[PDB]
Design a protein around this ligand. Structure first.
Ligand SMILES: *C(=C)C1=C(C)[C@@H](Cc2[nH]c(/C=C3N=C(/C=C4\NC(=O)[C@H](C)[C@H]4CC)C(C)=C\3CCC(=O)O)c(CCC(=O)O)c2C)NC1=O
Ligand SMILES: *C(=C)C1=C(C)[C@@H](Cc2[nH]c(/C=C3N=C(/C=C4\NC(=O)[C@H](C)[C@H]4CC)C(C)=C\3CCC(=O)O)c(CCC(=O)O)c2C)NC1=O
Ligand SMILES: *CCC1=C(C)C(=O)N[C@H]1Cc1[nH]c(/C=C2\N=C(C[C@H]3NC(=O)C(CC)=C3C)C(C)=C2CCC(=O)O)c(CCC(=O)O)c1C
Ligand SMILES: *[C@@H](C)[C@H]1/C(=C/C2=NC(=C\c3[nH]c(C[C@H]4NC(=O)C(C=C)=C4C)c(C)c3CCC(=O)O)/C(CCC(=O)O)=C2C)NC(=O)[C@@H]1C
Ligand SMILES: *[C@H](C)[C@H]1/C(=C/C2=NC(=C\c3[nH]c(C[C@H]4NC(=O)C(C=C)=C4C)c(C)c3CCC(=O)O)/C(CCC(=O)O)=C2C)NC(=O)[C@@H]1C
Ligand SMILES: *[C@H](C)[C@H]1/C(=C/C2=NC(=C\c3[nH]c(C[C@H]4NC(=O)C(C=C)=C4C)c(C)c3CCC(=O)O)/C(CCC(=O)O)=C2C)NC(=O)[C@@H]1C
Ligand SMILES: *[C@H](C)[C@H]1/C(=C/C2=NC(=C\c3[nH]c(C[C@H]4NC(=O)C(C=C)=C4C)c(C)c3CCC(=O)O)/C(CCC(=O)O)=C2C)NC(=O)[C@@H]1C
Ligand SMILES: *[C@H](C)[C@H]1/C(=C/C2=NC(=C\c3[nH]c(C[C@H]4NC(=O)C(C=C)=C4C)c(C)c3CCC(=O)O)/C(CCC(=O)O)=C2C)NC(=O)[C@@H]1C
Ligand SMILES: *[C@H](C)[C@H]1/C(=C\C2=NC(=C/c3[nH]c(C[C@H]4NC(=O)C(C=C)=C4C)c(C)c3CCC(=O)O)/C(CCC(=O)O)=C2C)NC(=O)[C@@H]1C
Ligand SMILES: *[C@H](C)[C@H]1/C(=C\C2=NC(=C/c3[nH]c(C[C@H]4NC(=O)C(C=C)=C4C)c(C)c3CCC(=O)O)/C(CCC(=O)O)=C2C)NC(=O)[C@@H]1C
Ligand SMILES: *[C@H](C)[C@H]1/C(=C\C2=NC(=C/c3[nH]c(C[C@H]4NC(=O)C(C=C)=C4C)c(C)c3CCC(=O)O)/C(CCC(=O)O)=C2C)NC(=O)[C@@H]1C
Ligand SMILES: C=CC1=C(C)[C@@H](Cc2[nH]c(/C=C3N=C(/C=C4\NC(=O)[C@H](C)[C@H]4CC)C(C)=C\3CCC(=O)O)c(CCC(=O)O)c2C)NC1=O
Ligand SMILES: C=CC1=C(C)[C@@H](Cc2[nH]c(/C=C3N=C(/C=C4\NC(=O)[C@H](C)[C@H]4CC)C(C)=C\3CCC(=O)O)c(CCC(=O)O)c2C)NC1=O
Ligand SMILES: C=CC1=C(C)[C@@H](Cc2[nH]c(/C=C3N=C(/C=C4\NC(=O)[C@H](C)[C@H]4CC)C(C)=C\3CCC(=O)O)c(CCC(=O)O)c2C)NC1=O
Lengths: 55, 177, 164, 56, 164, 177, 164, 177, 164
């Protein structure tokens, strides 16, 4: 958890654009509310983990 | 995401308005100008490999201080990420020319776009020059007013689409500022 | 939202890809049958006060049990809210004749309808059957054009299908 | 879907993971997002975490 | 970056683990052949203006088509930028003799080289063949030591390999 | 990321310059010093659990404020979390001497290290005290001024490494402050 | 396993990459000090029955409490297994002078040592201190060469370090 | 993974054999032929773009049945996987030439690899032809019997690595057979 | 010989019939088998110097009574006589992997040999330890290819059915 905020400044800046690249396009299609929840909160839309691996 | 047919219903639902023919005639003229919009958006994506080059080579023939090392923008992966960022915004605005609405832009890239650039060390004054050259060639490409490349068309007015692309690119430039 | 714009400009972004001619082709079918789609919209805009009243007590004929106390229709204050409820369904189906797909239906008036009604002890069986009254309530060469009813009637039995 | 298909199936997905371990290490770094331990060594103890996940 | 420091202190962090003697062993091979690696660096620092000019028109002998208008070498202003372009490749290969691995090559001058050049209508076939001119252009007991050319020549054919 | 080999190539990178025959005679000290550098680094990594048990005991020698209940560091998992944090300065200051440069130290722990400790309630005065114990025991191990531990060596100076390791624990002491 | 072969041929596979000269350099340090490393191996092969007996009751002098019933050393059958236990540590440290790193130690005799001993009520404090008896038990210009003890002694205090 | 320094210990660990100077002298020849062993592996990594263009062009020279459409190896993405599979087998033998041991070939490539190819439909006979060109040019690259390309070397016999690399490529070939 | 092809030749001579494709069947069945069979048939000529001082004395490790008077090791030239019958019995195993059948042995090796060895009084129950060391030292995916040492066993213990 520390090594998220430790490692860089641009790859973690690329994370918040990458977090919409899994949620908007193949997790919440059709729901605009769940689409701007990603673009207003990418780190909240990044542990949504809809790959049901039972974890 | 949201388009010109869907722009006119998100305000009418906010007043619980049944959409009748008081505002439908703007959309009959929009669906009149469907193939005009099509004959616009074909010519943009046809030569768009040439457009991202003509931007970022014209961006640097006014400023060689980027390629001066110790600057931000000199090396090739940095130029790959420059030509990553150059094409993707051109890719996004071509969805809005197709949409007739800029709501496909504002969420997928415009949220926090400038604040990541100062977090990366990106000079945004070179970005607003680069999006202008993309704005400069595209209005000559939706018309037949290029240098050598002339697609075939049916004639008539396309400046109303040119006012849309003029109102698209600065809205990106208002967001990367 | 939900239209052909929500298909092809989103899938080209989901592929990280240009608007190629697969995406440019899909909106041509809007253009040749928007005239088919948009004389149906001013029918239920012209009948936005006409067919709300004829659907409520057609539903309340076959659902006449509601008027007892302790249920969903115990007073006229429920029935004053009940003609609001069918019209709020009826607003969105008018808008789906404009956007092409069922855009304003799913993200506003369909998703999570099965978490609300019988929790508020509102019968869902009367909700589809008030709509299924209006589903067959059409006459295709007489009310509208013949190219207008097949967008209308396919959205109304969808409302029973989306509650399933 | 076959004994031959079953022993085929774990080999290319090992190669899919080793493809994707080579995009993590595109540039030759074991990059810091992948962590599989603690301060104290215990990745042999997290072997037994992952081989439990191999087993469960 | 890319070195043996990028291997073992990152893999011990990727294991969440101490710098054990697997990690302490890997840097010993730097020490016994840094003297092998770092008399090669001042050769192309001593020839940083000598072999840029001999590689450009050796490339432009076998690529002499560029001088027409409408191509990559239509004026001397392109050729004034072209000796900048081979030298900017030549800067990084000098630095990879210092860091050990190909550290300054991949994150600065290699990754995404195949998204730039023919988009700017620059021929990639002339780019590897200008480098492949300089790849065999060595003489191991005469220019440098015999322990110095095998780090140099393995980086230059890598530049054709990394563009593949 | 970057050894003391390669401090002198990233500033020549910023001038479009190359490492000519004037800057690398300190580097020709730095490659002729390959086995004196090697004879210091066995002497630190042999007694690594001495030095983490000499620092935290000498920290609880000078400060019985943390051992009080309700303090920072008194209980079981908590003191176990100290021996996490007690070695990780010694873990990367090895590589600061192995590479010759503290650039391998500057991004890998020193980014965000101070603000997490106030977010975890760690008092930084006990942190800067325990690292000064770790400096004082490491300069007596690279040299021949320990108490009882007498490793075999070849004679000569290594005060050039004693000034390199003194410029390292101050750099981590400025970044946890 | 754990050696410099486990570093560089695995990291080139972890990069999906050739054995470049970063990998070819790392094994040169084996060659110049294998003669330093491998006269230490036949010392504890020559003393494989000599120093097992001198370490057991040097440990059992400072751990003399074990001989009561209900503990780890309640009979000679424990002590017959106890000279097996120090020798099984002593087998692996001999092998780590051959493979270079601590190859046979970690995957065989180190990992999960802290899940076994006090569960079998075996004291771990006597295990490191029997080894720490043998850690200082050396004399570098007299028993072996001066280039042989620094591989030996760095592995024995590692055994206290790896149990930490 | 496992190599010639570790091959001599796993038969000795299986017998608890305390290793002494009866089998050291076979490793002492491996010690003395350190620089001869690295002399062959730098002539094989310096032309590895030549060999991947020499073999499957020489494999399509001998058998044009694959480039026929409806055959195995004919179209554009299909040829990209031909250079993909063909280069990676050169990466693994160059690992195996260095260890003095094909153990690192045997586990990362040579598990299950044969009937993945016929769960795809790769003709195994064409892969014996491509590996035999890669066997025949590589034994011409570790010596000076190439056509044009002569690197500078120190003379003498080096057949002992030519018997090593010929005992590696058939181990690839018997694995895919 | 009894080979892969030679079965259907005399079967064609039996009925007067011809080679059909079932007569042509197993010639594919050897060439689909022998992609790695000739590796160990080469390695019987490729490891035949270490194994003559492995399998020649693997009899002598168990049968230590060969230096009795009245045996094969009372004189030094008869110690050569059992060693050539490991040297020929690994050159004929080199000759048996390539035929397909037991082709050298049913003309020369097994040809009368149950009568032979007990009148020269050589123990044929001591010939099994020349073959039993070639049955347990076989680790297949490190020495040979993985299919090839399975079939190499099958020619090898068929000789054990001849002697025992
Ligand atoms: C309690 C009040 C108290 C202590 C506990 C102890 C801790 C301490 N130690 C030093 C200085 C050193 N410690 C060193 C480490 C070791 N010395 C050894 O002999 C063994 C080999 C090893 C431990 C495994 C070394 C080398 C030093 C340097 C001087 C020396 O040689 O002794 C300090 C002082 C720290 C400083 O001055 O910054 C402290 C507090 N001492 C206590 O007083
Ligand atoms: C098709 C008709 C056809 C080919 C294509 C070509 C391929 C081929 N090449 C060989 C043998 C070798 N190839 C070698 C590689 C190179 N030679 C060079 O000069 C450069 C340096 C390098 C390519 C970058 C080498 C060294 C050999 C060995 C012999 C030689 O020196 O030429 C074969 C034969 C393979 C075999 O014998 O199994 C083939 C098919 N030849 C064609 O006929
Ligand atoms: C995301 C980075 C990554 C790559 C590439 C990879 O292969 N694995 C990850 C992280 C990683 N973890 C390690 C090191 C070790 N891991 C273990 C446990 C292994 N034993 C097991 O049973 C399992 C489950 C299959 C694993 C992973 C051990 C014992 C180590 C040894 C290192 C040490 O402290 O001695 C590594 C480093 C080495 C490697 O190449 O795997 C990485 C990068
Ligand atoms: C939008 C109206 C969609 C739609 C949404 C539904 N989602 C349901 C559960 C669900 N949705 C998400 C994604 C989204 N919800 C969030 O709260 C956030 C982040 C803040 C996101 C991105 C998740 C992760 C979940 C599971 C739990 C949760 O609600 O958070 C849901 C209930 C049924 C179900 O479990 O799927 C609905 C109705 N569904 C639609 O029909 C439109 C298109
Ligand atoms: C009368 C013919 C009906 C009936 C109607 C009632 N609906 C009541 C509440 C209610 N209805 C909806 C669905 C509808 N209303 C909307 O605003 C929208 C979308 C714009 C839709 C599709 C909702 C979401 C709610 C709850 C919030 C609200 O009151 O609007 C209602 C009142 C119940 C109560 O307060 O106890 C009535 C009487 N009920 C029936 O049984 C017949 C079939
Ligand atoms: C001349 C011998 C060459 C040739 C060179 C040209 N390169 C041009 C632009 C260019 N080149 C690179 C790669 C190189 N430049 C760098 O700054 C770095 C890294 C530090 C590298 C590896 C890049 C990234 C660019 C674009 C940005 C820039 O201008 O620096 C170029 C100008 C093209 C134009 O403006 O139209 C030329 C002429 N071109 C050739 O065909 C021969 C082989
Ligand atoms: C005597 C000087 C010691 C002591 C020794 C005992 N160890 C016992 C069991 C045991 N020991 C180990 C570690 C060691 N044995 C190995 O086989 C290997 C690796 C090859 C190592 C490092 C293990 C893993 C075990 C359990 C399995 C086994 O018995 O080998 C033991 C017997 C305990 C019992 O049966 O109750 C004894 C007496 N114990 C001491 O306290 C002193 C210090
Ligand atoms: C047959 C495979 C070769 C060949 C082998 C011989 N090489 C001899 C000497 C030699 N080769 C190199 C370069 C090599 N060593 C390295 O460390 C690296 C890079 C990591 C490379 C490329 C050197 C430096 C030497 C001299 C050192 C030495 O081996 O003693 C050699 C003669 C041995 C001698 O000179 O004592 C032989 C037989 N040489 C050939 O001609 C073919 C191409
Ligand atoms: C077609 C259904 C049958 C025929 C004649 C009928 N015409 C009827 C007309 C009618 N429909 C409505 C409701 C109408 N208005 C709307 O906006 C919508 C939906 C969008 C609907 C269905 C009303 C108020 C009338 C009466 C006034 C008028 O004629 O417009 C009808 C229903 C009964 C009635 O009220 O008259 C029938 C029956 N002729 C045929 O051949 C068809 C069988
Ligand atoms: C070895 C190639 C052959 C022999 C003689 C030659 N010497 C040549 C020397 C030469 N090389 C350069 C470029 C040089 N400078 C650099 O910094 C680098 C790369 C890092 C290189 C390759 C120059 C400018 C010269 C001339 C001045 C000098 O001698 O230093 C050479 C090339 C042709 C030439 O210009 O002279 C040959 C040929 N002798 C042999 O036995 C080898 C076959
Ligand atoms: C160096 C320690 C001091 C000096 C003299 C001593 N020599 C001693 C020798 C000794 N050592 C052992 C155990 C030995 N054998 C091994 O295999 C290993 C480890 C790999 C070790 C440590 C034995 C059995 C002896 C006695 C027989 C002999 O001399 O070889 C020693 C220990 C006490 C003793 O038993 O004699 C001392 C002390 N001289 C100096 O100047 C050093 C201070
Ligand atoms: C006695 C008064 C009386 C009327 C005014 C109409 C009632 C009427 N029809 C329309 C609605 C309409 N009226 C027309 C007709 C026209 N629209 C034009 O601008 C043209 C001048 C004309 C063509 C002949 C059309 C095409 C619509 C639908 C489009 C729209 O106004 O939104 C509207 C405005 C929007 C609405 O409420 O629907 C009104 C009040 N019927 C009546 O009984
Ligand atoms: C034609 C077939 C063929 C064989 C059967 C072997 C036979 C063989 N094995 C070894 C020698 C060896 N062989 C092995 C390997 C192993 N020891 C084990 O415990 C495992 C069962 C096995 C695979 C892991 C080892 C470790 C040695 C060296 C030490 C020893 O003898 O144990 C040697 C001595 C020389 C050498 O190293 O090559 C020989 C001739 N080689 C061959 O060419
Ligand atoms: C080319 C075909 C060929 C074979 C099939 C084998 C088998 C074989 N071995 C021997 C021959 C022999 N074999 C042995 C061997 C032994 N006696 C014992 O009591 C022990 C069991 C064993 C110890 C190793 C001895 C001692 C002789 C010679 C008989 C004698 O001179 O006493 C002979 C007799 C002819 C000869 O001298 O070669 C043959 C055919 N060797 C071959 O050359």
């Amino acid at each position: 958890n520390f090594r998220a905020r430790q490692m860089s400044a641009g790859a973690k800046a690329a994370a918040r654009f990458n977090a919409r690249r899994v949620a908007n396009d193949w997790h919440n299609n059709g729901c605009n509310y769940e689409e701007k929840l990603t673009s207003r909160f990418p780190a909240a839309a990044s542990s949504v983990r809809p790959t049901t691996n039972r974890y | 995401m949201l388009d010109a047919f869907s722009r006119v219903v998100v305000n009418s639902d906010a007043k619980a308005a049944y959409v009748g023919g008081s505002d439908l005639q703007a959309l009959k003229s929009f669906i009149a100008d469907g193939n005009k919009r099509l004959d616009a958006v074909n010519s943009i994506v046809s030569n768009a490999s040439c457009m991202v080059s003509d931007a970022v080579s014209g961006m640097i023939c006014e400023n060689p201080g980027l390629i001066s090392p110790g600057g931000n923008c000199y090396t090739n992966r940095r130029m790959a990420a420059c030509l990553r960022d150059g094409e993707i915004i051109l890719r996004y605005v071509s969805y809005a020319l197709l949409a007739g609405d800029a709501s496909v832009l504002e969420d997928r890239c415009l949220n926090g776009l400038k604040e990541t650039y100062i977090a990366l060390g990106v000079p945004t004054n070179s970005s607003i020059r680069a999006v202008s050259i993309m704005k400069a060639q595209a209005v000559a490409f939706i018309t037949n007013t290029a240098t050598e490349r002339k697609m075939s068309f049916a004639a008539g007015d396309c400046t109303s689409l040119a006012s849309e692309v003029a109102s698209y690119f600065d809205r990106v430039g208002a967001a990367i500022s | 939202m939900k239209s052909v714009i929500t298909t092809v400009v989103s899938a080209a972004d989901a592929a990280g890809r240009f608007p190629s001619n697969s995406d440019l082709e899909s909106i041509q079918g809007n253009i040749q049958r928007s005239a088919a789609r948009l004389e149906a919209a001013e029918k239920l805009a012209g009948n936005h006060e006409a067919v709300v009243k004829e659907a409520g007590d057609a539903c309340f004929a076959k659902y006449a049990y509601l008027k007892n106390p302790g249920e969903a229709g115990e007073n006229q204050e429920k029935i004053n809210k009940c003609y609001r409820d069918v019209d709020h369904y009826m607003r969105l189906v008018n808008y789906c004749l404009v956007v092409g797909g069922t855009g304003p239906l799913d993200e506003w008036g369909i998703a999570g309808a099965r978490e609300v009604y019988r929790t508020l002890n509102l019968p869902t069986s009367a909700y589809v059957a008030s709509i299924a009254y209006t589903r067959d309530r059409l006459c295709v060469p007489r009310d509208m054009s013949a190219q207008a009813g097949v967008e209308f009637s396919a959205y109304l039995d969808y409302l029973i299908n989306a509650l399933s | 879907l076959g004994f031959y298909g079953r022993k085929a199936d774990d080999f290319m997905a090992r190669s899919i993971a080793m493809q994707a371990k080579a995009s993590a290490a595109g540039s030759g770094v074991y990059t810091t997002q992948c962590s599989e331990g603690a301060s104290k060594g215990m990745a042999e103890n997290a072997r037994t975490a992952s081989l439990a996940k191999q087993f469960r």
